[PDB]
């Protein structure tokens, strides 16, 4: 039996055998009042205190969210869909601890991605029991509200202030500050880590005054708040909040009434209308996301970044070789996960319309000009490869590289990885290559489970990443020091050295996508 | 009609249409007295002067040499065998000039490889008419004596001093100094270039006082004089000269008599006995090569290199990704060009005996230790891949990298390439990868001939190399400046930046084979 006393009550966890050893798991600990009724659209309210033993023995409800129905029965897509009931009562977290109870363990806090519209901490690829077993860190993950329920904004007004779901993450970092010593954890050594929108989240907690003292270091996998999808403008957020009201017949004139009306709606009615709050979107649409709210976020975060207004600490930042591909089967003409997707120039062109909706014509010609100077015009997969690079360079790679540069210019050590390994078990076709989202199972150690059909070179690869991730968290330095590993150089403006992660040989390289990102970074923002 | 007047007489060349243009070719110009009879084994003697018109309208005789009979009918091997008659009367050279006659053209002088035992300037892959047409440089190549006829040494004695075939190259560089203005060439801008033994040759002319003022710059492709096969010791050279005498019944006691006897032998008798002058050799045996003769070479050239005693000028130095593979089918157990050559640990072991004949047992275990720490022990082509890396790292790659470092430490600009492209037309099997010898056709522009079945990406690749090679020669800087090409950084000790040459993207990388060459370079020389 394993009972830990927390500030709000006792909690019982469960034992798990992992690799001939044991991890204790406390799945489903609540960390705020359920955000129902009067609390819907508001900042999470702190938790009341319960006598008796809360049983943390299974994953909790995931937050309400639309589901990916594009490929029913297909594991590639459905592995991302929620795997516990949806409910507004989803404000729970998970703790995994080494056995025996560590004395003062480093803490890794996972923040999932999903475009801020979806996702859940209980996915199999986010299971932190391998990290606990293997590295003897503590792993914490949390559910936070996504979609309108988590990010609806009517700026300035506490009935729907914006950013609630970032406040959910925050209040969870707080629970770790107050509660994690009880579990053997060191609150003074906490590293946040997250992928995609979860990484953008990590980057904004680097910017948020309220989060500054709730963690030590940050890891950002395929995401940063300067990505084009990551922050909704005040303009767009209002449009969207009013468009939502309109669609649920909740148009009022007293904004406080719009909200009271929206709180009478039922979760499905709200969910059902999210996709149409925008005239057009893309497979990468973030209808309801982070906004400048004057609370969590005090100013446009591009301004905060440029002017050095963020927590000073080491960062680890990374991306995957084919970020963009996964999106092309969600609406680009001629693409399919069921064939090789050789598209035409005219298809490439119609695809830019898919991903770059408004979108001066000259903007889009400029993307075509930059990405279609073939070397040479012979290769039939030319336009298929260009569309994916366009999508992942614009959306992930250049914004992560620009974040890393700017961040590092203020004096902190920063390490950048280029993930190039395609999973031996990937269900998506070969042409989609090293996809967005598919480093996560390496980071979490799923390939250390031999029962599991990954190659030997994949176990070794993941053991190494685990070790680098954990050394980063405990010591601010992502080195694997024991096995004659390539040394991971800090990333500096000027050199921009990054490390490549793959099964064959890892390399030190410089200036990832220098030519592409000059385009996205200097020129495109102008169109 | 095209007649040029030279210091020794007039010479007539022939016109050639290349790429809708014209190159003049003067194939077969003699540059020394034929080294027959009394002259066999002696330094080339200067040419007499002829009235009338010498017709330079076909390639001349190749020098006497053993031929590769391992794969009769096989183009991969037979493309290297001589393609003009063998004769001792082989001291000729070739000049290719742009049409119209250039005014003061940069000169590229090619020196072929072949282990110093074979080779000829008239191979199809050494045809300089594309370089002349495309870059408007002048291309010169020369035959020089190989085997015992070119390198037999009985140190100190002018009847067989050693290095005759290096003196043949030299006297040819001289003919260019005296004669090339006549052809529109600039004697003050000459770059030597050569592959394998031809590159080792280029590196020794960097060391030879007599060659200092006969050229401007040097290019070394897969070869340098510090390679283990490149310089025969005084010890070994005598053994070999006496062993040769012995085998032809020419043992005497008056060394001048040994030689007179050897000059009565006929070329075949000499050729026929070369292979056995050593108790054992390897596929990489250089029975009769360069020696320290106190004339061409004044001291062990490792000492000259270390202590900065070489011509001060820019160098371009390169190697191919799979240098070693080509040698494994010439005697390593379990290898064959006709299958995938998955060998066993015990085969790998017997192969080290093939390539490392004497060869402490501990020496060889040490190679096995360094090269067989698998990552991981699963992969069936593990030992096949290790044997080739062993062979090419020991024989080519580390010695070229060490030459480049040491050379550059004295202040000169140096550029290093890593050639990684496998020819679409390679006849050797896939497992032998990017083979030794197979950059040459890219350097010489054979892929610019579209008639010819190379891919489009190969034309582009070769056009770029041609341009970099030619800019290096004319301007000491191997940049392709017009087409947004990756800039080629100088190679410094400390950084050791090199440029990768391939069809996809060229890269800047650092410290090629750092771990391997620490082994070959610091440790192995000790065993
Ligand atoms: C800000 O919002 C308006 C609202 O328009 C929308 O009405 C919503 C309830 C929803 O159904 C949505 O799909 C619909 O478009 C946008 O105005 C619309 O914009 C498009 C193009 O400008 C027009 O074709 C529509 O006719 C127009 N609708 C109305 C009623 O005015 C507006 O575009 C939007 N701003 C953006 C681009 O985000
Ligand atoms: C690769 O498949 C795409 C996707 O479209 C198809 O999915 C296939 C696997 C098959 O079931 C097909 O019937 C289904 O429609 C193909 O793109 C489609 O091309 C077809 C041909 O006319 C068009 O009708 C569709 O508009 C277009 N689909 C969309 C909406 O994008 C594609 O042609 C196919 N190409 C290959 C084999 O390279
Ligand atoms: C220096 O040369 C001697 C000569 O040995 C050789 O006789 C030649 C004419 C030729 O046929 C060659 O194949 C033959 O070996 C070398 O002596 C020989 O070395 C090996 C191993 O040491 C012995 O097994 C031989 O019996 C021995 N021969 C004689 C007659 O002494 C000697 O090895 C060589 N040095 C090297 C290693 O290059
Ligand atoms: C790949 O081939 C090698 C080379 O030997 C063979 O060449 C083959 C293409 C075939 O004609 C064969 O008969 C010829 O001998 C094989 O290595 C050989 O292995 C055989 C099997 O007993 C031995 O008899 C030989 O000693 C050995 N040859 C030598 C001298 O190296 C090799 O086994 C084959 N392996 C594969 C298919 O991976
Ligand atoms: C646990 O260690 C505490 C501090 O450790 C951390 O120091 C921080 C500044 C940060 O660098 C982390 O990465 C370090 O690990 C110490 O003050 C506590 O008292 C310790 N608590 C125990 C053992 O109960
Ligand atoms: C031809 O140019 C001559 C010198 O050109 C070279 O200068 C050298 C020092 C070297 O750098 C080469 O790479 C240069 O190209 C000049 O002195 C001759 O007079 C010229 N001859 C002519 C035009 O007839
Ligand atoms: C907590 O789980 C344990 C199982 O042993 C048990 O005491 C009890 O059923 C649980 N408490 C509940 C269900 O509230
Ligand atoms: C709007 O009416 C609502 C009713 O609760 C109230 O929240 C708010 O004070 C009113 N605002 C004004 C002053 O119009
Ligand atoms: C270090 O090496 C051992 C044995 O070579 C291996 O089992 C282990 O996976 C390595 N550890 C790390 C941290 O990569
Ligand atoms: C040189 O070639 C030309 C061909 O026109 C001719 O004058 C003559 O036959 C040649 N001289 C010889 C063969 O010595
Ligand atoms: C050896 O005899 C030859 C005969 O030509 C001669 O070259 C040389 O002077 C003699 N050497 C001596 C002094 O034994
Ligand atoms: C430069 O570019 C043109 C057109 O893009 C091409 O035809 C040519 O091969 C290039 N030249 C060099 C030196 O590579
Ligand atoms: P991520 O959360 O996967 N996301 C950024 C918006 C890609 C949809
Ligand atoms: P190269 O001339 O090909 N050579 C160096 C000895 C390899 C046989
Ligand atoms: Cl092409
Ligand atoms: Cl490594
Ligand atoms: Cl790149
Ligand atoms: Cl393996
Ligand atoms: Cl390039
Ligand atoms: Cl390497
Ligand atoms: Na532009």
* N→C terminal distance of chain A: 62 Å
Q: Order of strands across the widest beta sheet of chain A?
A: 3-4-6-8-7-9-10-11-12-13-14
The unique ligands bound to this protein are: a molecule of 3 linked components (NAG-NAG-FUL), a molecule of 2 linked components (NAG-FUL), 2-acetamido-2-deoxy-beta-D-glucopyranose, diethylphosphoramidic acid, chloride ion, sodium ion
Q: Which geometry of chain A do the CA atoms define?
A: globular
Q: Tell me how many strands of chain A there are.
A: 14
Element-by-element helix/strand order of chain A: EEEEEHEEHEHHEHEHHHHEHHHEHHEEH
Quick one: CATH class of chain A?
Alpha Beta
* Fraction in beta strands of chain A: 5-15%
What is the count of structural domains of chain A? 1
* CATH fold title of chain A: Rossmann fold
SS field, number of helical segments of chain A:
15
What oligomeric arrangement do these chains adopt? part of a larger assembly
What CATH architecture label of chain A applies?
Answer: 3-Layer(aba) Sandwich
> If you compute it from the alpha carbons, what radius of gyration of chain A comes out, rounded to the nearest whole angstrom?
22 Å
Largest interface, and how many residues on either side? A-B, 13 and 13 residues
Q: Could you name the CATH homologous superfamily of chain A?
A: Alpha/Beta hydrolase fold, catalytic domain
InterPro entries (chains A, B): AB_hydrolase_fold (IPR029058), AChE-related_enzymes (IPR050654), AChE_tetra (IPR014788), CarbesteraseB (IPR002018), Carboxylesterase_B_AS (IPR019826), Carboxylesterase_B_CS (IPR019819), Cholinesterase (IPR000997)
Family (chains A, B): Belongs to the type-B carboxylesterase/lipase family.
Keywords (chains A, B): Disease variant, Disulfide bond, Glycoprotein, Hydrolase, Phosphoprotein, Secreted, Serine esterase, Sialic acid, Signal
Binding site for substrate (chains A, B): 114-115
């Amino acid at each position: 039996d394993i009972i830990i006393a927390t500030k709000n009550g006792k909690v019982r966890g469960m034992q798990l055998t992992v690799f001939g050893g044991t991890v204790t798991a406390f799945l489903g600990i609540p960390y705020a009042q359920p955000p129902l009724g009067r609390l819907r659209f508001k900042k999470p309210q702190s938790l009341t205190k319960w006598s008796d033993i809360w049983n943390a023995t299974k994953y909790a409800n995931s937050c309400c969210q639309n589901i990916d129905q594009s490929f029913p029965g297909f594991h590639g897509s459905e592995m991302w869909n929620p795997n516990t009931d949806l409910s507004e009562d989803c404000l729970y977290l998970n703790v995994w601890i080494p056995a025996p109870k560590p004395k003062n363990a480093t803490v890794l806090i996972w923040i999932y991605g999903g475009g801020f519209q979806t996702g859940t901490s209980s996915l199999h690829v986010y299971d932190g029991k391998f990290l606990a077993r293997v590295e003897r860190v503590i792993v914490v993950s949390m559910n936070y509200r996504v979609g309108a329920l988590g990010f609806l904004a009517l700026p300035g007004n506490p009935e729907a202030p914006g950013n609630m779901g970032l406040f959910d993450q925050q209040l969870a970092l707080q629970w770790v500050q107050k509660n994690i010593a009880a579990f053997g954890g060191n609150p003074k050594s906490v590293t946040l880590f997250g992928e995609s929108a979860g990484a953008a989240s990590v980057s904004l907690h680097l910017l948020s005054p309220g989060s500054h003292s709730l963690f030590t270091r940050a890891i950002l996998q395929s995401g940063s708040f300067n990505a084009p999808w990551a922050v909704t403008s005040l303009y767009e957020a209002r449009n969207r909040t009013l468009n939502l009201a309109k669609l649920t017949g909740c148009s009022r004139e007293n904004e406080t009434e719009i909200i009271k009306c929206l709180r009478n709606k039922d979760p499905q009615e709200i969910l059902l209308n999210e996709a149409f709050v925008v005239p057009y979107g893309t497979p990468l649409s973030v209808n309801f996301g982070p906004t400048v709210d004057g609370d969590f976020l005090t100013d446009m975060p591009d301004i905060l970044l440029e002017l050095g207004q963020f927590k000073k600490t080491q960062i680890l930042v990374g991306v995957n070789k084919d970020e963009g591909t996964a999106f092309l089967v969600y609406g680009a003409p001629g693409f399919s996960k069921d064939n090789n997707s050789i598209i035409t120039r005219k298809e490439f062109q119609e695809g830019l319309k898919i991903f770059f909706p408004g979108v001066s014509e000259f903007g889009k010609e400029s993307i075509l000009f930059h990405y279609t100077d073939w070397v040479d015009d012979q290769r039939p997969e030319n336009y298929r490869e260009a569309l994916g690079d366009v999508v992942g360079d614009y959306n992930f790679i250049c914004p992560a590289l620009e974040f890393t540069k700017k961040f590092s210019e203020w004096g902190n050590n920063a390490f950048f990885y280029y993930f190039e390994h395609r999973s031996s078990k990937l269900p998506w076709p070969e042409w989609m290559g090293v996809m967005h989202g598919y480093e996560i199972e390496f980071v979490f150690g799923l390939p250390l489970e031999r029962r599991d059909q990954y190659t030997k070179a994949e176990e070794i690869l993941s053991r190494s990443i685990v070790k680098r991730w954990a050394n980063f968290a405990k010591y601010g330095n992502p080195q694997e020091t024991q096995n004659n590993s390539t040394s991971w150089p800090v990333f500096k403006s000027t050199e921009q050295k990054y490390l490549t992660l793959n099964t064959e040989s890892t390399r030190i390289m410089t200036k990832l996508r220098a030519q592409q990102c000059r385009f996205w970074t200097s020129f495109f923002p102008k169109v």
